[PDB]
Write a protein that binds this ligand. Structure first.
Ligand SMILES: CCCCCCCCCCCCCCCCCC(=O)OC[C@H](COP(=O)(O)OCCN)OC(=O)CCCCCCCCCCCCCCCCC
Ligand SMILES: *[C@@H]1O[C@H](CO)[C@@H](O[C@@H]2O[C@H](CO)[C@@H](O[C@@H]3O[C@H](CO)[C@@H](O)[C@H](O)[C@@H]3O)[C@H](O)[C@H]2NC(C)=O)[C@H](O)[C@H]1NC(C)=O
Ligand SMILES: *[C@@H]1O[C@H](CO)[C@@H](O[C@@H]2O[C@H](CO)[C@@H](O[C@@H]3O[C@H](CO)[C@@H](O)[C@H](O)[C@@H]3O)[C@H](O)[C@H]2NC(C)=O)[C@H](O)[C@H]1NC(C)=O
Ligand SMILES: *[C@@H]1O[C@H](CO)[C@@H](O[C@@H]2O[C@H](CO)[C@@H](O)[C@H](O)[C@H]2NC(C)=O)[C@H](O)[C@H]1NC(C)=O
Ligand SMILES: *[C@@H]1O[C@H](CO)[C@@H](O[C@@H]2O[C@H](CO)[C@@H](O)[C@H](O)[C@H]2NC(C)=O)[C@H](O)[C@H]1NC(C)=O
Ligand SMILES: CC(=O)N[C@@H]1[C@@H](O)[C@H](O)[C@@H](CO)O[C@H]1O
Ligand SMILES: CC(=O)N[C@@H]1[C@@H](O)[C@H](O)[C@@H](CO)O[C@H]1O
Ligand SMILES: CC(=O)N[C@@H]1[C@@H](O)[C@H](O)[C@@H](CO)O[C@H]1O
Ligand SMILES: CC(=O)N[C@@H]1[C@@H](O)[C@H](O)[C@@H](CO)O[C@H]1O
Ligand SMILES: *[C@@H]1O[C@H](CO)[C@@H](O)[C@H](O)[C@H]1NC(C)=O
Ligand SMILES: *[C@@H]1O[C@H](CO)[C@@H](O)[C@H](O)[C@H]1NC(C)=O
Ligand SMILES: *[C@@H]1O[C@H](CO)[C@@H](O)[C@H](O)[C@H]1NC(C)=O
Ligand SMILES: *[C@@H]1O[C@H](CO)[C@@H](O)[C@H](O)[C@H]1NC(C)=O
Ligand SMILES: [Ca+2]
Ligand SMILES: [Ca+2]
Lengths: 973, 48
């Protein structure tokens, strides 16, 4: 085994060889030279990240105040309009004309139900809606089990028809506005503009079971947040059909709950245990509810019924005050069949003043006495609900919000506050969106205070979407580098706006569906959960980020600079990036907005080119017939002008881009000058490289392909044969290697993938990249990232000439940080190139981490898909490992032993690059396995919830809670 | 009532209406087995 100085001297002649090959062939110092040679085609402006945040915080203020004004007027009209409605019952005499969504639009149908008359609308196709729509009226959604033509429903479509004039007045004023909808108390919803619903009832074989009342946006503006507590009666009498019904009501009751709502679930049979692991009221987020809905299911009925120990346990649960709580409506609901005891004594003290509200549910078909339960409900200002059937569950476990809304409708104007929802997928397929809601109240005869019998309910709730693609147009990231971004946050820790946030729903648990019990054609529910990713789950968690995260939940302003490690774009690397954060509150709302920058991004380039010939000359550089002397040029699909659209077929896009500058001068009076201009300047900078430097050295021996991925989207792979293999995203702010090249001050090597499809190994090769780094007036800039795809065959020859190809004495390999295998001496390994090195000899890799040579961090990706397990895709959690050098020390000697054998490995790290060289004795001499240490998205179901909630994350609830008005009717059950 | 009282706790959603839960109902069920009518479908609920 060679000495430590021989490995030292032999690494230094093959890290000097790779870097000279990459410093020379790519042209780092040449592209630095021509950014500095000009100085005057551009100027260098600063990103004032105090100022940028303040500017952004105000476009989201004004956007969400403009939405709010529209909401207020609609509400006023609805209140005024229905106070002048007459309650007619002759509807076959005077037809109600409306367009009904989810109905066949074929003219020849002509069903013509009594009372109603439909509309055939004309349906232009649209952008900002990715569906055909009509701007002349509002559609109407009736849920499926609700009959339309009922006097109760027919009378909504009469009075609600005056909203189409106010609907129209909102979009005339603001073209950008998205869905406008009124969700009725009656269960009928009207939205503008009209479009056909996505599931028709019976024209396909999937049938929608969508109810407006059920909806989260409808619920948050229906009522105030609430600490509920479900009691379940588990006595012996319940076992049977009735027990079956209860498990489906509680799961149903929960759907109703929200993050702001706290909830626990207890159960009694002569003792009250608590159904799961929790013991206090927990946040009723997606996870906690998933635990409770998984413990409600396993319940077995046995034993004597005791309503006294069931309501003692409930009240005690209600009084914890140590835990984090909603502290608003306090209510307890019991599911039971029949009661012989009213438990008068427990209610006298625990709730002598009736602070708590009791709702009693009688379920199943049975003969047990319901008088005592009704009495309990009446005594406590709750309500009573029967459920005999499965189809009766859905409208009675949502109906309690008519009771809880009462002291809000007695609060008057004070209760008309806009609230904005958690991001969620739109019913109509719009994408991620948030809705601002306002409740409409039933005011009839207010002038004189004549009735009030049913004047304590809301007419319904009114909402208006903001799409998250509308907010991302108020937070522009182009001046800032790929590293910089804006993050938005609730007072709940959830992230409103984040690079990491994705359309797929956030998943819980490992998905298990039983194929042996899905009959083929019945169509179960798909999903309704909100997409609540948290800030400490969108990014790698620190302790110096939980400080930042708490500090901008409680509405403060500030900046912070620290060293933290960024997870890479692809999930394979972790790079220590020195960042600065800066946050401020959006003053109209409860959102607070932040901005990450990396020091060195504090300055950007603005293009200062305006000459006729110079913008002209740089623009034919990106012509696809002129790639024989330029290099297969790419271009990023920014929204350059409003007219040319991002196309995802890039040769399509670059023609429509470059047609645009010929057919019209780049002045373009409805199009931003700087973004297009910077691109033009850039293409004259990645031209002078490809003309005056790369086309001189037309073939370097080991060099396969040469790229300049730059800022302005223009990536230039140098031979067109090589550009067929360029499998990157052509958007330069989505490339992984672009972003890892900017963090590092040394050449970076990217490992090719293992297996997969497409040619990514011998054909393209392993790639090196390096950020260009210029200084203008003593101000650091990193404009571009040069690079090289390496030839893996040639590199091997230099490497071979104490390692002999296929040697049985000892094997040596080169590994980039992250532990991926780039080069293998044996060749039984270099076939499996770009593979995680702990999968080809897991014994050595395990030891290396122990020596402190390597470090890692497992994280959770709450938005990913996986195949089900037997117990096409669902959402699930994956755990993800990344590996990264944590020790700066250059060399590491030692020996590892498996038991009865020693192997002496020597590790040396090449200077000036992330690569590491290790020499070790052949694996075959000691037959050892430990277990195969693998690095992949690995399906898992963590973290366990029962341990998170003992020390929950900081949170801030709603300031205004409406409950317990003294003059509430409290007489109807 | 002793053999089949409170023993029909099946978790199906179907109606087994000739059961043995009260005394009036038990008496009615007993009468239905003497008239012969559908007497064996009353027995299958008692084997299950
Ligand atoms: C042998 C005679 C048997 C008489 C059975 C009988 O009288 O049942 C009385 C029973 C009363 O039950 P209940 O209403 O709960 O009152 C109990 C006292 N607090 O009532 C019942 O449970 C049903 C009684 C039906 C009697 C039918 C008589 C005609 C055969
Ligand atoms: C709810 O439906 C009823 C029935 O269609 C609507 O009442 C109708 O309202 C219109 C305009 O308010 C009435 O038109 C007027 O008719 C009189 C003659 O009757 C004429 O002198 C006026 O110049 C005008 O043309 C219509 O007659 C009336 N129908 C009845 C039976 O009274 C009502 O407008 C609908 N509510 C909402 C909010 O849309
Ligand atoms: C808003 O509140 C008002 C009352 O404050 C509600 O109006 C009431 O609606 C009921 C519906 O059951 C009407 O009662 C019906 O009366 C007819 C006679 O026309 C009778 O045939 C029915 O059997 C039933 O009793 C009642 O007339 C009406 N009250 C008033 C004062 O107009 C209204 O329904 C609420 N708004 C919404 C959208 O529900
Ligand atoms: C958000 O609103 C606050 C006030 O509630 C603004 O703070 C003010 O800032 C101005 C100068 O910008 C000062 O003159 C005032 O004294 C500040 N307010 C108070 C009460 O001291 C803040 O600038 C706003 N920020 C944004 C982004 O809109
Ligand atoms: C992420 O990895 C880093 C390794 O660099 C971890 O940081 C070290 O954590 C240990 C305890 O696990 C401390 O003793 C060291 O002082 C830390 N070193 C540095 C440089 O921070 C970090 O804990 C990991 N994060 C998680 C969540 O495991
Ligand atoms: C005590 C009880 O019956 N609860 C069961 C538990 O025993 C079981 O381990 C779990 C998973 O099957 O489901 C629940
Ligand atoms: C298409 C194909 O052959 N895929 C294979 C896969 O079966 C195998 O498990 C893997 C080894 O990690 O190599 C690859
Ligand atoms: C900051 C830190 O931990 N540095 C250590 C260093 O002290 C040690 O000499 C080296 C070799 O083990 O590993 C690293
Ligand atoms: C895995 C292995 O080789 N274990 C060896 C065994 O073969 C040998 O018989 C024994 C005595 O020398 O020592 C140990
Ligand atoms: C191998 O060594 C030769 C001679 O020093 C050098 O020209 C070549 O670039 C090296 N291989 C590479 C490209 O790493
Ligand atoms: C808000 O409304 C005003 C007035 O219609 C308009 O000028 C402005 O552009 C709107 N802002 C946003 C972000 O929609
Ligand atoms: C982080 O900050 C220190 C001190 O300002 C600086 O020396 C270092 O270069 C920064 N980190 C990186 C990766 O540049
Ligand atoms: C290093 O390995 C030793 C022996 O296997 C073990 O006791 C120790 O915990 C390891 N160090 C770390 C940091 O895990
Ligand atoms: Ca009971
Ligand atoms: Ca017969």
């Amino acid at each position: 085994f060679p000495s430590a100085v021989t490995i030292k001297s032999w690494v230094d002649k093959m890290q000097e060889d790779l870097v000279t090959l990459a410093k020379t062939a790519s042209g780092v110092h040449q592209l630095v030279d021509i950014y500095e040679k000009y100085q005057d085609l551009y100027t260098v402006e600063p990103n004032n990240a105090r100022q940028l945040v303040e500017i952004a915080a105000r476009d989201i203020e004004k956007l969400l105040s403009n939405r709010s004004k529209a909401l207020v007027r609609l509400a006023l009209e609805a209140e005024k309009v229905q106070a002048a409605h007459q309650w007619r019952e002759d509807f076959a005499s005077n037809e109600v004309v409306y367009y009904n969504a989810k109905d066949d639009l074929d003219p020849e149908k002509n069903d013509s139900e009594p009372g109603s008359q439909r509309i055939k609308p004309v349906f232009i196709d649209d952008a900002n809606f990715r569906r055909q729509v009509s701007y002349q009226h509002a559609a109407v959604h009736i849920p499926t089990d609700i009959y339309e033509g009922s006097t109760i429903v027919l009378n909504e479509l009469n009075w609600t028809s005056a909203l189409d004039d106010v609907f129209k007045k909102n979009r005339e004023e603001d073209p950008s506005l998205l869905w406008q909808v009124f969700g009725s108390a009656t269960g009928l919803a009207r939205y503008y503009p009209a479009s056909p619903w996505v599931d028709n009832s019976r024209t396909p074989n999937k049938i929608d079971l969508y109810d407006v009342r059920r909806r989260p946006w409808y619920i948050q503006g229906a009522a105030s947040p609430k600490d509920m507590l479900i009691l379940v009666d588990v006595s012996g009498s319940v076992s049977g059909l009735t027990l079956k019904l209860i498990r489906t009501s509680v799961s149903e009751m929960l759907e109703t709950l929200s993050d702001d709502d706290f909830v626990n679930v207890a159960s009694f049979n002569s003792n009250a245990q608590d159904v799961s692991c929790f013991q206090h009221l927990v946040q009723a987020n997606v996870r906690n509810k998933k635990v409770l809905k998984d413990a409600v299911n396993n319940i077995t009925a046995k034993g004597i019924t005791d309503y006294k120990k069931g309501f003692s346990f409930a009240f005690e649960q209600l009084l914890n005050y140590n835990v984090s709580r909603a502290n608003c409506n306090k209510i307890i609901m019991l599911f039971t069949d029949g009661g012989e005891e009213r438990a008068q004594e427990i209610f006298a003290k625990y709730n002598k003043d009736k602070k708590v509200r009791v709702f009693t549910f009688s379920v199943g078909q049975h003969n047990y006495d319901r008088g005592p339960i009704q009495w309990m409900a009446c005594e406590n200002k709750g309500y009573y609900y029967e459920i005999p059937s499965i189809g009766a569950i859905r409208i009675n476990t949502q109906e309690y919000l008519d009771v809880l809304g009462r002291p809000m409708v007695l609060a008057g104007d004070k209760a008309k506050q806009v609230q904005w929802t958690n991001v969620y997928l739109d019913a109509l397929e719009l994408g991620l969106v948030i809705t601002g809601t306002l409740p409409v109240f039933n005011i009839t005869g207010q002038f004189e205070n004549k009735t009030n019998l049913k004047n304590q309910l809301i007419l319904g709730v009114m909402g208006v979407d903001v799409s998250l693609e509308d907010i991302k147009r108020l937070t522009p990231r182009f001046t800032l580098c790929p590293n910089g971004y804006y993050f938005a946050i609730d007072p709940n820790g959830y992230v409103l706006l984040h690079p990491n946030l994705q359309p797929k729903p956030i998943g819980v648990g490992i998905p298990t569906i039983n194929l042996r019990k899905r009959r083929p054609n019945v169509q179960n529910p798909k999903s309704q959960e909100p997409v609540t990713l948290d800030f400490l789950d969108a990014e790698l968690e620190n302790d110096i980020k939980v400080e930042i995260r708490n500090k901008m939940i409680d509405g403060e302003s500030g900046e912070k600079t620290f060293r933290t490690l960024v997870k890479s774009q692809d999930e394979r690397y972790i790079d220590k990036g020195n960042r600065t954060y800066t946050w401020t509150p959006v003053n109209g709302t409860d959102y607070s907005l932040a901005l990450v920058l990396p020091t060195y991004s504090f300055y950007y380039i603005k293009a200062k080119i305006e000459e006729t010939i110079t913008q002209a000359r740089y623009s034919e550089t990106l012509k696809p017939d002129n790639f024989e002397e330029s290099g297969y040029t790419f271009l990023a699909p920014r929204d350059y002008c409003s007219d040319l659209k991002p196309s995802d077929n890039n040769t399509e896009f670059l023609l429509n881009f470059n047609e645009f500058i010929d057919r019209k001068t780049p002045n373009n009076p409805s199009c931003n000058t700087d973004l297009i201009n910077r691109v033009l300047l850039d293409a004259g900078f990645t031209n002078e490289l490809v003309q005056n430097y790369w086309s001189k050295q037309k073939n370097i021996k080991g060099v396969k392909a040469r790229f300049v991925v730059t800022d302005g989207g223009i990536t230039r792979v140098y031979p067109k044969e090589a550009g067929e293999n360029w499998q990157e995203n052509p958007e330069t702010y989505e490339d992984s290697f672009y972003k890892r090249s900017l963090d590092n001050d040394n050449y970076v090597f990217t490992a090719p993938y293992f297996n997969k499809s497409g040619p990514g190994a011998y054909e393209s090769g392993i790639m090196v990249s390096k950020a260009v780094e210029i200084y203008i007036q003593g101000k650091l800039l990193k404009p571009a990232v040069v690079g090289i795809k390496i030839d893996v065959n040639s590199w091997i020859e230099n490497f071979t000439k104490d390692c002999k190809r296929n040697s049985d004495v000892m094997d040596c390999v080169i590994l980039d940080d992250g532990g991926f295998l780039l080069m293998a001496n044996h060749d039984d390994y270099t076939n499996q190139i770009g593979r995680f090195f702990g999968e080809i000899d897991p014994s050595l890799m395990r030891h290396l981490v122990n020596i402190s040579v390597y470090a890692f961090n497992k994280s959770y990706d709450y938005q990913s898909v996986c195949e089900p397990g037997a117990a096409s895709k669902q959402s699930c959690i994956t755990e993800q490992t990344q590996y990264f050098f944590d020790n700066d020390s250059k060399s590491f000697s030692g020996v590892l032993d498996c038991g009865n054998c020693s192997r002496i490995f020597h590790v040396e790290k090449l200077m000036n690059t992330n690569l590491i060289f290790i020499m070790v004795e052949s694996k075959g001499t000691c037959p050892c396995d430990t277990r195969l240490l693998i690095q992949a998205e690995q399906t898992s179901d963590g973290p366990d919830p029962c341990d998170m909630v003992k020390q929950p994350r900081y949170r801030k609830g709603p300031d205004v809670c409406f409950d317990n008005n003294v003059l509430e009717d409290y007489t109807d059950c | 009532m002793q053999l089949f009282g409170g023993r029909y706790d099946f978790e199906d959603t179907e109606v087994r209406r000739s059961n043995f839960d009260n005394f009036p109902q038990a008496l009615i069920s007993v009468f239905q087995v003497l008239t012969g009518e559908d007497w064996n479908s009353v027995m299958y609920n008692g084997i299950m």
